[PDB]
Amino acid sequence: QVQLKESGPGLVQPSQSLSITCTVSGFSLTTYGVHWVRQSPGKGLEWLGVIWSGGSTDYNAAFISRLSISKDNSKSHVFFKMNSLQANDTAIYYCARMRITTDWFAYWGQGTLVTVSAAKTTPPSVYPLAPGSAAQTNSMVTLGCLVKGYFPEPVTVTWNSGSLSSGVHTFPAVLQSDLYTLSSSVTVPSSTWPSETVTCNVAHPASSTKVDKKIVPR
Amino acid sequence: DILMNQTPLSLPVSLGDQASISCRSSQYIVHRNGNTYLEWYLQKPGQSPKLLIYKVSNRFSGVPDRFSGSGSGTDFTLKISRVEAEDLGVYYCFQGSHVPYTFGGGTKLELKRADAAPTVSIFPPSSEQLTSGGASVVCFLNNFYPKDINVKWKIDGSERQNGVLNSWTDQDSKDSTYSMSSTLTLTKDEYERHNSYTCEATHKTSTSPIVKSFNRNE
Numbered sequence: 489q490v491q492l493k494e495s496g497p498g499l500v501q502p503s504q505s506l507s508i509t510c511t512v513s514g515f516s517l518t519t520y521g522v523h524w525v526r527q528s529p530g531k532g533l534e535w536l537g538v539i540w541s542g543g544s545t546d547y548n549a550a551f552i553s554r555l556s557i558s559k560d561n562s563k564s565h566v567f568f569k570m571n572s573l574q575a576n577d578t579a580i581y582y583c584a585r586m587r588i589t590t591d592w593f594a595y596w597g598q599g600t601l602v603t604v605s606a607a608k609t610t611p612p613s614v615y616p617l618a619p620g621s622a623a624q625t626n627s628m629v630t631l632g633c634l635v636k637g638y639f640p641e642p643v644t645v646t647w648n649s650g651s652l653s654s655g656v657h658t659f660p661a662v663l664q665s666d667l668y669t670l671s672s673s674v675t676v677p678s679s680t681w682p683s684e685t686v687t688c689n690v691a692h693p694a695s696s697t698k699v700d701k702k703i704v705p706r
Numbered sequence: 707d708i709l710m711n712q713t714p715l716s717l718p719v720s721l722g723d724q725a726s727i728s729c730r731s732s733q734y735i736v737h738r739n740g741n742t743y744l745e746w747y748l749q750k751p752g753q754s755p756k757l758l759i760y761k762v763s764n765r766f767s768g769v770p771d772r773f774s775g776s777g778s779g780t781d782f783t784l785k786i787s788r789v790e791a792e793d794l795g796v797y798y799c800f801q802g803s804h805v806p807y808t809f810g811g812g813t814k815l816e817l818k819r820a821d822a823a824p825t826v827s828i829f830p831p832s833s834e835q836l837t838s839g840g841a842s843v844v845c846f847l848n849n850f851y852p853k854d855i856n857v858k859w860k861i862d863g864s865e866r867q868n869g870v871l872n873s874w875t876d877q878d879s880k881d882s883t884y885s886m887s888s889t890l891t892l893t894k895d896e897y898e899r900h901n902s903y904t905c906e907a908t909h910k911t912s913t914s915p916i917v918k919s920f921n922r923n924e
């Protein structure tokens with residue numbers, strides 16, 4: 489059916505530019521305008537600009553100096569280019585058909601997550617989290633894994649090679665300095681640990697590292 | 707720029723309830739070529755926003771009849787006759803009348819449930835980390851509802867602000883609870899200077915904080 493396909497980078501170096509292509513299908517760029525929007529945690533959804541069916545553009549005034557949008561009608565391509573990116577430009581970017589007059593064709597692209605950083609690829613340190621020596625006993629016990637100092641995202645954390653899946657919580661990564669850190673926890677019946685071994689498996693495809701850490705009593 | 711102000715910021719609902727969400731603009735949203743460009747979007751976890759209503763009250767195709775929009779001038783309303791599970795997510799109003807076009811800040815529609823106190827767990831630095839010269843204390847606060855929660859760190863009973871990084875999950879799709887991690891990062895030297903480490907959680911389920919603690923000497 490009707491679709492907008494986005495293509496562009498996951499990572500942009502600070503001061504460098506961000507090029508995204510939106511490929512339209514199901515309708516003609518000669519017929520409708522295409523808008524660009526971004527979404528960040530801090531700022532919410534922000535409209536960036538539009539290229540109208542007729543070929544003219546309008547831009548959000550807070551971006552007009554470093555923003556540009558053009559299109560190729562024949563190949564159904566819309567081109568988005570933003571210059572001089574900085575850390576606060578980290579966001580998901582979307583092309584969208586919006587400001588709708590008719591009952592048809594209104595769809596947004598799968599967004600492009602763009603991370604702005606000068607970090608280099610860095611494998612994680614992986615640390616097991618066993619309960620303290622004197623921690624109080626429950627019918628359940630929580631264990632954990634701390635994954636620290638990696639770049640870029642993502643890592644994938646699994647427990648017992650994915651065999652332990654229920655009672656798992658893996659938290660979003662957060663920027664610590666210019667590297668990422670996350671933790672994951674698993675909860676098992678108290679009777680099963682340490683008698684039944686529990687190991688976190690942490691993969692980081694960008695550094696080709698795969699590390700297992702058994703959680704051992706301290 | 708035109709401010710779009712949404713109310714409420716979050717709306718707990720159970721399935722089968724009615725729901726009403728409001729959006730107020732800082733200016734009259736005037737027609738353009740006889741069209742009033744006021745739209746409502748729903749964004750589910752991990753997906754792009756999808757158009758629900760365009761031109762104030764027109765249901766986009768595929769959008770079920772339980773959705774309706776109304777309003778004029780500065781005041782607009784999205785109504786849901788009868789909430790289904792697939793209606794959970796973040797709703798945004800959008801105005802396409804005055805450049806720069808602008809979105810509301812979002813209203814999260816979320817599923818109401820029985821109250822749950824968080825399961826709190828605290829973990830001393832791993833000895834692997836200690837050898838590297840770092841010391842992260844980790845606290846997991848898992849499977850709580852409602853979402854409001856505050857975490858306080860204490861070192862020898864003295865409130866600790868610096869070096870704390872928190873990470874929250876979104877509402878779990880299965881049990882509808884929330885989870886949070888809190889990590890206090892210190893140098894190894896700093897860690898050694900102190901004996902007692904406490905994570906204190908304040909949650910609606912009680913006035914008395916949930917305290918978990920360990921002592922560096924055991």
Ligand SMILES: *[C@@H]1O[C@H](CO)[C@@H](O)[C@H](O)[C@H]1NC(C)=O
Nearest residue numbers: 531550572573574575576577
């Ligand atoms: C974000 O950072 C840049 C570069 O430091 C600054 O000039 C820009 O205005 C900031 N933008 C916002 C919206 O805070």
